[PDB]
Amino acid sequence: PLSETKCTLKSFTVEKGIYQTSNFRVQPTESIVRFPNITNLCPFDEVF
Amino acid sequence: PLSETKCTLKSFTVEKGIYQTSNFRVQPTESIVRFPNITNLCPFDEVF
Amino acid sequence: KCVNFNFNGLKGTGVLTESNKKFLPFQQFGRDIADTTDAVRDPQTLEI
Amino acid sequence: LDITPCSFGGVSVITPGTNTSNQVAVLYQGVNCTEVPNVFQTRAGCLIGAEYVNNSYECDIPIGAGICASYQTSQSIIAYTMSLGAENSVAYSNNSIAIPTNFTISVTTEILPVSMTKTSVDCTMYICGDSTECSNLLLQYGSFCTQLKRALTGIAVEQDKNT
Amino acid sequence: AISSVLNDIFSRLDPPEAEVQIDRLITGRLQSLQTYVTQQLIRAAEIRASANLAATKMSECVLGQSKRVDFCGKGYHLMSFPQSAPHGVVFLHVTYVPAQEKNFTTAPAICHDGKAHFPREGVFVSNGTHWFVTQRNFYEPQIITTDNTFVSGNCDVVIGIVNNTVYDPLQPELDS
Amino acid sequence: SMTKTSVDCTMYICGDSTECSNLLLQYGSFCTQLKRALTGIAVEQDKNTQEVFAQVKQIYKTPPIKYFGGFNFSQILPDPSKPSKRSFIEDLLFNKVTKFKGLTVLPPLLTDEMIAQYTSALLAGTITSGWTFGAGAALQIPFAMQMAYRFNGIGVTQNVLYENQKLIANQFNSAIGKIQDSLSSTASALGKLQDVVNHNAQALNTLVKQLSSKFGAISSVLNDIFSRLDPPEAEVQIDRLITGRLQSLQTYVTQQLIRAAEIRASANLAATKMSECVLGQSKRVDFCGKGYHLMSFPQSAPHGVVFLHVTYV
Amino acid sequence: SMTKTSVDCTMYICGDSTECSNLLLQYGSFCTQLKRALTGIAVEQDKNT
């Protein structure tokens, strides 16, 4: 995090103070794939 | 240069004051065309 | 009267009054300080 | 080989009014006059068209870095340094004083602006020149000019507040 | 774009092809309106700070006497008279400026009987023969009395004191 | 004041390109209106120097007898033996406070010798005339009488001045030398001048580094678009580059204008402090210093002023 | 004083889109300057107190 302040300020020397570097966010891990339920079906057995 | 003040300000009467009209730049006269030298040749005499 | 205009492609919306200025015989239309359509000669009758 | 761009700079025109005279003075700002092609070199740039003098007077048209210009007298444009006023020192000792015996009553005017011209620009007629096809894609840009209508009303409600 | 008139764009090109020339006229005219209203609001801020300076000049110079220097005019401010003007107020500031002066000699205190006499109002001035009391902005010489002075210490601690008498008005009143 | 800058649309937008100036005429006068605002802030900072430094036009000078009651005024006065007319504090004031893309830096009207000649004329009128040279003609008033009126403005009788004349002047000359020891050591005491020159420097390098960006084009080089691509398909990449370079140029004129509004409010606060703390005695509380204000001595500075406010504590 | 605020360049412009974030690099450091202007506001609101 000391080297994180050097990259956003474009300087190799960081003075005394409070500096903002980047933003934190929790990355997603899973993916919920959803579909409607099997109902309202159609009579395919009348020809098959 | 008195008419250059009228050409920029869009007025036929110029009041007392200092006005900037355009910019001076030296135009290019010649054109230098460069190329690498006659070293690193290819043996074309072996087939010709 | 507030009507629509169609004078060989020169469309517009406004009224028509009699012009009191001098005009050119080859002139199709004139332009104001905003450089838009403000005075139209008729292609058949010649009223500017 | 060192690549340097060739010599360029701003051109200004020092001139009086057209009802008085018609002489000009070309100022190549940032350009030395050995590289340009009755002349004087200043710190801002070498001045072409002015007679430099040694005395300094009250001028009207400033140039830069102390050099100023005015139209004086068989008449031409002259250039000199900016005068800081007449030098008149006051003596001092440990036992003397200077008491005024008379005064004067003068009226000095002071002009301060308060308000300005209240304007109002609508989104339908300025952007679209009585066009019906322009207004359908004007709704696709959201609310730009609704915020400019609130800003122009917020200016105009401050103008009668300032009075 | 190809043209500035919006009727020439729609009635000549395809409606898939005229729309990309339309938004260059939309965002081109909106950017010219955006640099107008930001220059308007910057000019609205400096016209507020000058009107607040004019309201300070209406409250101190007009409604009373301000003790500031170079605020209600150059010099000692006496009174002000505002006048109406389009988009501003023009003020007529009456000031007090001294014109003619004259050099004299001075001393900070007077040694009367071993005690130092300091001036209460005004300064000690002399014309070479006698010592008088006048103010700093105008010349009006008065005789040095005990009512115009006040005693503070001896003459050995102050610097620049000269020897002179102080006219005590109670001393000729006992035989008169 | 601030740094006077001027930029043209011929060299900053177009990197020696003839087709770029031909497409600049289709956009109208975007670079003409920001040119009128950049000379508007150029004559505003020249008017800010005339409103603060040029209060009176009569140039005064000091007497050669430097005896004002044991008061050492040699440090705030400029040395005539030096070739540069600067003071002993002002030698440390100018020492602590320290290209081809069309960006130019205009020099100001009043130079550093002309500012210090205006500063030494106001400093000589403070010690020889006091409060009368800011209200018309200067009068000859001694330095013992000037401290009698300035004590009388805060309700202090004149008996503490002459009975403690050795104690007052030794307290002033030790406090003047404590300013020169603190200014030569602590370089962060002049940070109110340092953010004026650093914000103008950080505005200039962001004008250069935005030219390296493409603004949605395939290249930021104007030669690479015209020489390689087909000229109706190349010109839509020029209109992406001429819009992104104009919006950063419209960014720079708008941040400088609110900085011009901030530098106009401080110079009007400086010209109030040049007329109330220097030209007279201020009856305000915590305006010309914390406490009872007696007198002030202004000094020259890069893009600003330095006030030496004495206080009665 | 006023309410101190901050805006993110990546989150306000791009609503969790990875193809939007790399296309902001062609515009350069422009959105840092709107971030650096608002952080300079938040210092002087603490100075006014």
- The sign one gets for the Cα dihedral F68, F72, F73, F74 is positive
Any chain C CB within 8 A of the CB of E32? no
State how far the Cα of F3 lies from the Cα of F304, in Å rounded to an integer.
Answer: 11
Which H helix or E strand runs over C10? strand C10-14
The letter for the amino acid at E138 is F
Integer Cα distance of F240 and F215 in angstroms: 6
Backbone dihedral region of E73: left (phi > 0), alpha (psi from -120 to 50 degrees) or beta? left
DSSP per-residue codes, E35-47: HHHHHHHHHHHHH
- Position F96: which residue type? K
Using N-to-C axis directions, what is the helix angle for F231-273 and E19-57, rounded to 10°? Answer: 10
CA distances from F282 to B38, E97, F274, F277 (A): 84, 19, 11, 6
CA distance, residue D32 to nearest chain F CA (Å): 15
The answer to whether F196 and F303 are in contact (CB under 8 A) is: yes
- C-beta of residue F215 within 8 angstroms of C-beta of residue F245: yes
CA–CA gap between residue C37 and residue C6 (Å, rounded): 12
Residue type, A24: F
Please tell me which residue of chain D has the smallest CA distance to B2: D24
Residue with tokens 């004019």: E54
C-alpha F66: how far from chain center: 30
- Alpha-carbon span F16 to F117, nearest angstrom: 44
Any chains having at least 3 CB pairs less than 8 A from chain G are: A, F
Element spanning F292, H or E = strand F292-301
d(CA F126, CA D82): 24
CA atoms within 13 A on the CB side of F191: 3
Show the CA angle centred on residue D69, arms to residues D66 and D73, nearest 5°. 140
Q: How far is E58 from chain C (nearest CA, A)?
A: 43
Residues on chain F touching G27 (C-beta within 8 angstroms): 213, 215-216, 244
Task: Write the DSSP symbol of residue G28.
Answer: -
Closest CA to F50 of F302, F271, F276: F271
In this complex, do F206 and G33 lie within 8 Å of one another by their Cβ atoms? yes
The candidate with the shortest Cα–Cα distance to F249, out of F6, F19, F22, is F6
Whether residue D37 lies within 8 A of chain B, CB to CB, comes out as no
Q: How far apart are CA F14 and CA F7, in angstroms?
A: 12
In angstroms, what CA-CA distances link A40 with A34, A48, F122? 17, 18, 96
> Within an 8 Å CB–CB cutoff, is residue D65 touching chain B?
no
Structure tokens at E79: 């009174």
- Structure tokens that stand for D31 in this block: 């350009």
Nearest residue, CB atoms, B24 vs list D8, D16, D17: D8
Angle at E20 between CA E18 and CA E21, to 5 degrees: 65
Token pair belonging to E172: 């000729």
For residue F157, the chain E residue with the least C-alpha distance is E120
Residues F257 and E65: their CA atoms lie apart, in Å, by 36
Question: Strand runs (DSSP E) across chain D, as ranges?
Answer: 8-15, 25-29, 39-41, 46-48, 51-52, 61-64, 67-72, 76-81, 96-100, 103-113
Decide if E132 contacts E126 (C-beta within 8 A): yes
**Of E137, G25, E10, F291, residue with least CA distance to D132:** E10
Work out how many CB contacts closer than 8 A connect C with D.
3
Task: Assess contact for D79 and D67: CB atoms under 8 A.
Answer: yes
DSSP E58: I
3-state secondary structure (DSSP) of residue D37: coil
Task: Verify whether the Cβ–Cβ distance F210 to G37 is below 8 Å.
Answer: no
Alpha-carbon span C46 to F95, nearest angstrom: 79
- Mutate which of D15, D27, D35, D36 to disrupt the B interface (most B C-beta within 10 Å)? D15
Question: Residue E77 in contact with residue E65, Cβ under 8 Å?
Answer: yes
Surface-to-core class of residue G40, CB atoms within 10 Å of its CB (0-12 exposed, 13-18 middle, 19+ buried): exposed
Nearest-by-Cβ selection for B20 from D12, D17, D19: D12
How far are the Cα atoms of E163, F30, F40, F204, F214 from residue F245, in angstroms, in the given order?
Answer: 82, 12, 22, 14, 9
Residue of chain B whose Cα is closest to the Cα of D68: B18
Q: Does D112 touch chain E (CB under 8 A)?
A: yes
C35 contacts chain E (CB < 8 A)? yes
Q: Return d(Cα D111, Cα F195) in angstroms, integer.
A: 33
* CB within 8 Å: E101 and F137: yes
Strand, helix or coil for residue D107: strand
D23/D17 Cα distance (integer angstroms): 9
Q: Is A27 on the interface with G (CB under 8 A)?
A: no
Whole-number Å distance between alpha carbons of A45 and D44: 96
Q: Calculate the CA dihedral of residues D37, D43, D49, D53 and round it to 10 degrees.
A: -140
| F95-101 long-range Cβ contacts below 8 angstroms, 24+ apart | F96/F183, F96/F187, F96/F190, F97/F190, F97/F193, F97/F194, F97/F197, F97/F301, F97/F302, F100/D5, F101/F11, F101/F12, F101/F207, F101/F208, F101/F211
D-chain CB neighbours of E160 within 8 Å are 94-95
Report yes or no on chains E and G touching (3+ CB pairs under 8 A): no
Task: List chain G gaps (C–N > 2.5 A) by preceding residue.
Answer: none
Alpha helices (H) along F55-164: 90-96, 112-128, 143-152, 159-162
Cα F284 to Cα F287: distance, rounded to the nearest angstrom: 6
E30, E93, E105 member nearest D108 (Cβ) = E93
Burial E96-116 (b: 16+ CB within 10 A, else e): bbbeebeebebbbbbbbeeeb
Q: Judge: F216–G37 Cβ closer than 8 Å, yes or no.
A: no
- F212 → closest Cβ in G23, G28, G37: G28
Chain D residues with CB under 8 Å of B24 CB are 8-11, 28, 31, 36
Residue F5 backbone phi and psi in degrees, to 5: -120, 150
Distance between CA atoms of C33 and C38, rounded to whole angstroms? 10
Chain E residue with minimum CA distance to F251: E35
Contact at 8 Å (CB) between F267 and F51?
yes
What CA–CA distance (Å, rounded) separates A1 from B48? 67
d(CA D99, CA F308): 29
* Contacts with C, D 79-138, CB within 8 Å: 129-130
Helix, strand and coil percent figures for chain C, each rounded to 5 = 0, 35, 65
Residue D79, beta-bridge partner list: D52, D69
Report whether D35 contacts D7 (CB < 8 A). Answer: yes
Resolution of this deposited model, Å: 3.7
Interatomic CA distance for residues G46 and G3, integer angstroms: 11
In a 10 Å sphere around its CB, with 0-12 CB exposed, 13-18 middle and 19+ buried, how is residue D13 labelled? Answer: buried
Which residue, chain included where needed, has tokens 């006497």?
Answer: E65
Q: Positive or negative CA dihedral for A34, A39, A40, A46?
A: positive
CA angle F307, F309, G1 (to 5 degrees): 75
Cα atoms in the Cβ-side hemisphere of radius 13 Å centred on B17: 11
Q: Which residue has the tokens 């403005």?
A: F153
The answer to whether E9 and E25 have CB atoms below 8 angstroms apart is: yes
Please state whether at least 3 CB pairs lie below 8 Å between chains B and F. yes
Residue F108 per-residue DSSP state: P
- The beta-carbon neighbor of D90 closest among F108, F113, F128 is F128
Pairing between β-strand E110-111 and β-strand E162-163 as defined by DSSP bridges: parallel
H or E element, residue C4? strand C3-7
Are B1 and D24 a contacting pair, CB within 8 Å?
yes
Q: How far apart are CA F53 and CA D82, in angstroms?
A: 14
CA dist B20 and A45 (Å) reads 89
- Written as one string, the DSSP assignment of E59-105 is IIIISS----SSSSSSSEEEEEEEEEETTEEEEEEEEEEE--EEEEE
**F 6-35 residues inside an 8 A Cβ radius of B:** 8, 10-11, 35
